[PDB]
Amino acid sequence: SQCGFNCLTDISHSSFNEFRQQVSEHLSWSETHDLYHDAQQAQKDNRLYEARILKRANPQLQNAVHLAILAPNAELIGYNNQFSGRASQYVAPGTVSSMFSPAAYLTELYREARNLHASDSVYYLDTRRPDLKSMALSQQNMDIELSTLSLSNELLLESIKTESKLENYTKVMEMLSTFRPSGATPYHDAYENVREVIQLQDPGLEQLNASPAIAGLMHQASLLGINASISPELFNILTEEITEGNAEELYKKNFGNIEPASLAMPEYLKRYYNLSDE
Amino acid sequence: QYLLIDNQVSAAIKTTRIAEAIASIQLYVNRALENVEENANSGVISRQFFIDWDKYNKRYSTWAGVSQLVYYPENYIDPTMRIGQTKMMDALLQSVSQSQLNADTVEDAFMSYLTSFEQVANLKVISAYHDNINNDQGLTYFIGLSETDAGEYYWRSVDHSKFNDGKFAANAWSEWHKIDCPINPYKSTIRPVI
Amino acid sequence: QYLLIDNQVSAAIKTTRIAEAIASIQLYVNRALENVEENANSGVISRQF
Amino acid sequence: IPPYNLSTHGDERWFKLYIKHVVDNNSHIIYSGQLTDTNINITLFIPL
Amino acid sequence: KTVLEKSKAGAQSRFDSYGKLYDENINAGENQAMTLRASAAGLTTAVQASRLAGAAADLVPNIFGFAGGGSRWGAIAEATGYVMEFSANVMNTEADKISQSETYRRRRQEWEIQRNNAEAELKQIDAQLKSLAVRREAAVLQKTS
Amino acid sequence: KTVLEKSKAGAQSRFDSYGKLYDENINAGENQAMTLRASAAGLTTAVQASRLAGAAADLVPNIFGFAGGGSRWGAIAEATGYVMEFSANVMNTEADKISQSETYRRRRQEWEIQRNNAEAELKQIDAQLKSLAVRREAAVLQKTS
Amino acid sequence: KTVLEKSKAGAQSRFDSYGKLYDENINAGENQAMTLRASAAGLTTAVQ
Amino acid sequence: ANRWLKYVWSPSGYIVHGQIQNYQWNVRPLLEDTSWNSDPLDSVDPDAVAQHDPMHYKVSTFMRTLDLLIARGDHAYRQLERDTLNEAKMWYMQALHLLGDKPYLPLSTTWSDPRLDRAADITTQNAHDSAIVALRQNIPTRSANTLTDLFLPQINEVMMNYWQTLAQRVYNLRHNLSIDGQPLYLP
Amino acid sequence: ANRWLKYVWSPSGYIVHGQIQNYQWNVRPLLEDTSWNSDPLDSVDPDA
Amino acid sequence: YPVYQYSGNTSGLNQGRLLFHRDTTYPSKVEAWIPGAKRSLTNQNAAIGDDYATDSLNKPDDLKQYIFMTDSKGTATDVSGPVEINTAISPAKVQIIVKAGGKEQTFTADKDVSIQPSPSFDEMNYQFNALEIDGSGLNFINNSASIDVTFTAFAEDGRKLGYESFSIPVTLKVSTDNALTLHHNENGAQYMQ
Amino acid sequence: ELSQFIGKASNFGQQEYSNNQLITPVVNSSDGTVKVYRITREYTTNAYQMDVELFPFGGENYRLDYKFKNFYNASYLSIKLNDKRELVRTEGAPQVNIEYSANITLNTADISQPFEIGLTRVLPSGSWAYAAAKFTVEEYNQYSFLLKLNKAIRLSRATELSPTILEGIVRSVNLQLDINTDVLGKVFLTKYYMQRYAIHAETALILCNAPISQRSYDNQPSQFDRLFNTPLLNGQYFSTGDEEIDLNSGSTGDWRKTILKRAFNIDDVSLFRLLKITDHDNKDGKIKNNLKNLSNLYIGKLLADIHQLTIDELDLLLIAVGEGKTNLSAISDKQLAT
């Protein structure tokens, strides 16, 4: 790639460190500096030409009386030919299609940021959240208010159904209700649905207190399930009886691979159960 | 910190998708640059984007600003302050910065600017110097004289590198500067040096 | 702009005949001088008036 | 200066015009500009 | 009712007052004070021209003929010295001039605020009169009852 | 109800005015006046350099050749003297500049307070309106009775 | 009751503001202005 | 302030030796564009860009003329007399014919809702830069599909703001409302 | 204020001639501890 | 904005070609229809800034008739008042006129222009070696009189291209005067004669 | 406002769907003819995770653009006119947010009937995920179209009703897209219904015997999807017209019954009474599931709701009027107004 070409000067736009690393052999730092500085000047001349064309094509200006502004049809025709017309179509502010839109800012943000790490590495953007690449830049995504924490769950569920290879998000919730080894699980989405609806429609359970003919049907143990969160699998977990004969397999049921020495460490209990130190 | 979205938020917190992606990539960039994440391409860090990150690229409003400035500068430019402007400009602005601005008051402040303009307009270039070895490169410095019973000397500088197309750029031209030192050389024996 | 009198006013807006004629001609002159109408007598524009 | 020529612009449309033998026998560049149809009237100052 | 009417009158005297005050923003005397500072701040031109003529004339020989001039060598420096000091004070006067101006503007603004406080108040009190008149009608019917 | 509403508008003309005043903390004029004080406060340097040049040039002989210089011996002391006084004055200007600045700050602070006093009021008033509207329903129901 | 509560909010916002202003008697800037005048006021010895 | 704006630009304010003349801007460097600054993009300075080509200065003038016009109209409208209200109308009308008719806008665009993946593709960027320099040196007369994911130019917020503010002051004029929009008519 | 702190300390704020460099603090004496004051406990001084 | 080109000094090859300028930004097809001719010159996908609809069946007579130009999509214009102009400028026709005294004086371009410029729309510059103009008369009014000089040009079609009138001021020192004299007197009063 | 009637137009002849209605003119340089095409899109499932558009390029020759949202790892994708025949088929697993166009031919008998383009993607295990749209395609002589649009606009301006609302009225009332005296009368019944009740136009419609509209317009979700499927169970209610739904007083049924229950805010009992008000001839609590039955049920519940009436009170008043025994079923628009 020699020597001093136009597209050569354009494509060289990149940090001086990259430029100096690739051209290490060929150039002598007097050439590297001059070439890079002439490259920036060419970059800037390019933005200026573009901005001059795009600015003079502004439909607000054409309507203006006595505002003599030279709109050079020469460069405009060529521009509207080589680019499918951009000087032709002007977008109203706040729209996604705008160059100044938060959409475009996100675009450059991603474009410059994903390369920050190696694809090998963990923190590679596209590795940690694939959500980003597939996402669309549509005015619906930019404009409509959406609830956070629901976005958080979209990711968590998607990552679990991909990893545990279950068919549906539903099946993920089932798997979530069976899971005994993690702290703050077994979670039972359906169960929490029941519990909360009950506690909402009949706050304080007064009718259950009022009509003991019904209350007499259910046992108090399961009734504890209303006021405090006790999943059926969790009831199963508290209820099961412990002998030293059971202790091993019951440890395998209630706990994952971690050995007793791991679990007994106080900081590990704290991390595991989401417990305050006190 | 890893997944770029908070998992302890309240149910009721509203952020559009595009925006949440933005704040996410923002936390990535900020953690990556200040080196809490293990390593990063020192090659990509040097890019003009991340150089302008701390001032212009963290904030959306600032990026919109910088980007717009090239296309629509009229929004940002004001007659009050132009950086950089002449000293005599400040003088004009102070003469004319009042609550009451009679037409007479303004024309007087204008004549005062014109008189302050006439001293610089008419300078006599006495002598010079060139910083570099040869003509072809460097910046030349000049010295000038003010028609006055006693000597007032102004020096302006020109860059030679800006003489691109066979004419001086006018970027190259530097504003004249007053000099405070008391100088009385005859006949024309004064010369400036770097 | 052509007929010099607004046809989009509220029903209830009161202007004396002489004054509305006055404002009408004021717009005629304002539009003619700053050259919004095609052409105007360069002879009359120069007048002290 | 006449509009487009001798050939089509290729390789490059631009034209530059020089001065020579004024103070130095080597040619010196006085003007640099893009060539455009149809007519261009340029007035320069030349030192002797 | 007469109570309300008299309070209405009071608020409206206030509105009249701050109205008239905001209407004449800068008094004749006041304008003269400001433009005076403008006048004294100027004439830098003159003190430079004068101090310089003085320097040039005091660089030519004073004394003759048998012994030389005795011309004061540092005279240029000294005139520059004067030009420095007088520049400083000019700036200060200009500053004060501008500062003076701003006070008046801010004062005007305050008056404006207060004018509104009056205006709104005399609307409020006025509306109250309507309320009171309504009860009057009511109590009249009561007597009828 | 119309009474309370007019009071609302008034309280809000105040909140809006003190809000807008607080937002533009320092006016263009005000900043220019202050920067004037900074500029006049500067240039201690030039006046030291010049007064000193005056001392040095007035330490070399004035008169020649037959009779000696007559050079003013205490010229140095005198220049030191001017540099003293101009120091004092410089200081005063900076102080004044600082004080000016601080005044503007305290003013904003006052304004801030008043903005809140305005706001609290238009919240207070606003709540009163609901109270009144509640009573409206009551009296409506009374009529029904 | 809520009306009275909002008035309480106002009264206490003021109390907090004038409290903090009274607690900060002299600002750094103000202190420097004062000691500037003291310093310029001194130095009689030198000019004598 | 209008006399002083007139020293830079005036629609048909220019009569000398008793006759109108060809110049709308009294300042010549605006008449033929003057690259008073070469390499303006060097430091971030709004003045410098206009210095680069006076179009922007010419426009900033335009906007200040508008500013004075709407200021006259406002100070007129606040007087609230049947006459000064018509004055406010006349000023606002001058601003209107100074701008011309509002700018039109195309309902749908060449923009197609893109995956951000492809919108941020460096390939499209290099192609874009390349076609720009190609246009810059008149060389020509994948690449076919990639120029779609580029964003479009937007009208500056400020001018649009001006069309809108004239429109609201006209709306408020034609109905009995004040500038603020409270009705002059009692219910 | 961030620029001015940066002249003293910066996470990856240091790029000269196009590459980041080993120093987190631009002020050198902090980099290798420098006994700019020996015997500070003489008077009660946090600076010392 | 339409203009119809003819076969003339720089024509190829048609006797006619139809030129127009279009403000609209979007790409479109421009059509020119004639009632008198009953035929239409067409341009398909005309360029953005300026373009030509070449003339098939080229007859100058036809484009005298009323012409309707339109975008198929959205734009319309009716063309009226066609006029034939010949840009040809004869130096004999190009003039300078001078007024001093009571006799008008005339200076043609062909005779007094030593070197005359290449024909260009942009600009054309004529330099006249020198002109002799008679004096006394004009007679001075209040010791002052002016020389009228009028620059004019005529195209070949018979139209003046424009004019600019100039004045050269002449003020004659007058012999029959005594140098105005200021005086002081014994009585203290000071006067100017 | 103009964009409500006619689909938005660019500077190039390119034209797009706006308010799920496309208006594009087709000229044949062969015939020298001007023919006006109009298409209506109504999403079955889900309207999210799916976008299908149809552009009419020529007679019996149409272009189909489909964009998939959300990801499925598929052995193949099949675009089918109905179950047979398939229109287009791809071996690749389609990808997120990428517009694919495949050229298609549709018959003169496929045009007459309002058809359903159904996109089915298949992975080995699942086996499939389905999403589909229902299209209405109308050919209009240019004069006839401009005329019909002219009366449509003048009517929307006068009545202050949405173009889509009026279109719903016309279609429910008369032969398709004809503005008749009966049509106007129904427009007035709608205006008075929403005048005397707090209700919007779209509710006044179903009070005027129209079906629940599955169209989405003005960035608003369809009346239907908004009605049943506002939250998700998760399943999108299919409205097959093939699914039996058990609305018996004494029964627990499919997720579908629960869907009806939230849609109407009712327990099983009142739901049964409501059904009985829809049809007194329904011997078992069985529902055809078609849009029509839902429209009848909702007609009933709304009759109960515009008045301050529980379903019981509605039942009783219906007897005391006494229209009941008369059933909602299919009932004369005149009789429904009575």
Q: What is the DSSP string of K102-117?
A: EEEE--HHHHHS-EEE
Write out the two tokens for J18: 């139809």
Are the beta carbons of A59 and J25 separated by less than 8 Å? yes
Contact K97 H115 (CB under 8 A): yes
Residue closest to H15 by CA, chosen among C47, F41, K251, K78? C47
Closest Cα partner for K98 from H119, F27, A236? H119
Q: Provide the token pair at E130.
A: 């309507």
Q: Of K63, K58, K55, whose CA–CA distance to K30 is shortest?
A: K58
Short-list K302, K228, K305, K303, CA closest to K260: K228
What residues of chain J lie within 8 A of the CB of A77, using their CB?
Answer: 47-49
Q: Identify whether the C-beta of residue K62 lies closer than 8 Å to the C-beta of residue K56.
A: yes
Instruction: Tell me the shortest Cα–Cα distance from B42 to chain I, in angstroms.
Output: 7
At residue H33, φ and ψ (nearest 5 deg) are -55, 135
With CB atoms and an 8 Å threshold, state whether A144 touches B16.
yes
| Sheet containing J28-33, strands listed edge to edge, beginning at the edge strand earlier in sequence | J40-46, J28-33, J67-71, J76-79
Q: Do D41 and J123 touch (CB under 8 A)?
A: yes
Query: CB neighbours of K24 closer than 8 A, spacing ≥ 6?
Result: K7, K15, K36, K37, K55, K56
SS3 at position B135: coil
Q: Between J23, J26, J49, which is nearest A77 by CB? A: J49
State the chains in contact with F (3 or more Cβ–Cβ pairs under 8 Å). Answer: B, E, G
Give SS3 for J69. Answer: strand
Candidates F40, F46, F38, F34; CA nearest to F104 is F34
Q: Answer whether A184's CB lies under 8 Å from B41's CB.
A: no
Give me the residue from B80, B97, B180 closest to F49, CB to CB: B180
Instruction: Return the structure tokens found at E17.
Output: 């007052």
Interface of K with H in 86-105 (CB under 8 A): 96-99
- Nearest-CA distance from F114 to chain B in Å? 26
Q: Residues near K222 by Cβ (< 8 Å), separated by ≥ 6?
A: K42, K43, K47, K213, K214, K215, K216
Residue A84 CB partners (closer than 8 Å, separation 6+): H110, H147, H148
Interface E–F counts its CB contacts (< 8 A) at 129
Q: Does A54 reach chain H within 8 Å, measured CB to CB?
A: yes
Q: Are E41 and E94 in contact (CB under 8 A)?
A: yes
Residues 6+ apart with CB under 8 A from K70: K48, K49, K96
Chains K and F touch, contact meaning at least 3 pairs of CB atoms under 8 angstroms apart: no
Residue of H nearest to K11 (CA): H106
For residues F50 and E80, give the distance between their C-alpha atoms in angstroms, rounded to a whole number. 7
Q: Are J16 and J4 in contact (CB under 8 A)?
A: yes
Residues of G in contact with F87 (CB under 8 A): 40, 43
Give residue I15's identity as a one-letter amino acid code: I
Q: How far apart are CA A89 and CA A76, in angstroms?
A: 13
Contacts of B182 in chain F (CB under 8 A): 50, 53, 57
State how far residue F42 is from chain E, nearest Cα, in angstroms: 8
In the structure, do chain I and chain B come into contact, i.e. share 3 or more CB pairs under 8 Å?
Answer: yes
User: Which helix (H) or strand (E) segment is K142 a member of?
Assistant: helix K142-159
Do residues C28 and H6 touch, judged by C-beta distance below 8 A? no
Determine the Cα–Cα distance for residues K45 and K120; give it in Å rounded to an integer.
Answer: 11
Which helix (H) or strand (E) element contains residue K79? Answer: strand K76-80
Resolution of the experimentally solved model in angstroms: 3.5
Q: How far apart are CA A13 and CA A17, in angstroms?
A: 11
Residue in F87, F120, F128 nearest the CB of G10: F120
Instruction: State how far the Cα of B192 lies from the Cα of B185, in Å rounded to an integer.
Output: 13
DSSP states along J39-68: -EEEEEEE-SSEEEEE-TT--TTGGGS-EE
* Distance separating alpha carbons of residues F82 and G47, to the nearest angstrom: 8
Nearest CA in chain B to H160: B75
Chain A CB contacts of H55 under 8 Å are 55-56, 69-70
The pair of structure tokens assigned to G32 is 């420097």
Residue E76 to residue B182, Cβ atoms within 8 A = yes
In this complex, do J49 and A80 lie within 8 Å of one another by their Cβ atoms? no
What is the spatial distance between Cα A135 and Cα A149, in angstroms, rounded to a whole number? 18
| Residue closest to H80 by CA, chosen among H176, H166, H187, H162 | H176
Token pair for J143 = 């010791």
* CA–CA min distance B52, chain E (Å): 38
Class of residue H165 by CB neighbours under 10 A (exposed 0-12, middle 13-18, buried 19+):
middle
**Nearest-CB residue to H90 (from C13, C15, C23):** C23
- Whether the link from the prior residue into A204 is cis, omega within 30° of 0, is no
CB pairs under 8 A between B and E: 52
Q: Is A117 on the interface with B (CB under 8 A)?
A: yes
A83–chain J Cβ distance below 8 A for any pair: no
Sign of the Cα pseudo-torsion (F139, F140, F145, G3, in order):
negative
CA distance F109 to chain E (A): 15
Out of J23, J48, J50, name the one closest to residue A80 (CB): J48
The interface residues of chain A toward chain C in range 49-68, judged by CB-CB distance below 8 A, are 65-66
Nearest CA in chain A to C31: A65
Q: Which residues of K touch A169 (CB under 8 A)?
A: 234
Q: Please report residues of K whose CB lies closer than 8 A to that of H111.
A: none
> Which residue(s) pair with J191 in the sheet?
J183
Asked if the Cβ–Cβ distance from E80 to B149 is below 8 Å, we say: no
**Contact between chains at F46 and B97 (C-beta distance less than 8 A):** no
Q: Which residues of K14-34 are buried (b: 16+ CB within 10 A; e: fewer)?
A: ebbbbbbbbbbeeeeeeeeee
Neighbours of chain B (3+ CB pairs under 8 A): A, D, E, F, H, I
Instruction: Give the chain A residue nearest H157 (alpha carbons).
Output: A93
Q: Both tokens of residue E41?
A: 């701040």
**C-alpha distance from residue A70 to each of A58, F15, H54 (Å):** 12, 48, 11
Instruction: Mark yes or no for CB contact J23/A59 under 8 Å.
Output: no
* G–J touching, 3+ CB–CB pairs within 8 Å: no
Who's near A127: CB < 8 A, 6+ residues apart? A119, A121
Work out how many CB contacts closer than 8 A connect B with H: 50
| Closest C-alpha to K44, from K178, K304, K242, K219 | K242
Could you tell me which of H35, D12, B160, B64 has the C-alpha nearest to residue A45? H35
User: How far is the alpha carbon of G2 from chain F, nearest alpha carbon, in Å?
Assistant: 7
Name all chains with 3 or more CB-CB pairs below 8 Å to chain K: A, H, J
CB E63 within 8 A of CB E69: yes
Residues contacting residue E32 through CB under 8 Å, at least 6 positions apart: none
- Tell me how far apart the alpha carbons of residues E93 and E39 are, in angstroms, rounded to a whole number: 10
Contact at CB, K12 and J25, closer than 8 angstroms: no
Q: Are F and G touching by the rule of 3+ CB pairs within 8 Å?
A: yes
Q: What residue of H is the nearest CA neighbor of A6?
A: H133
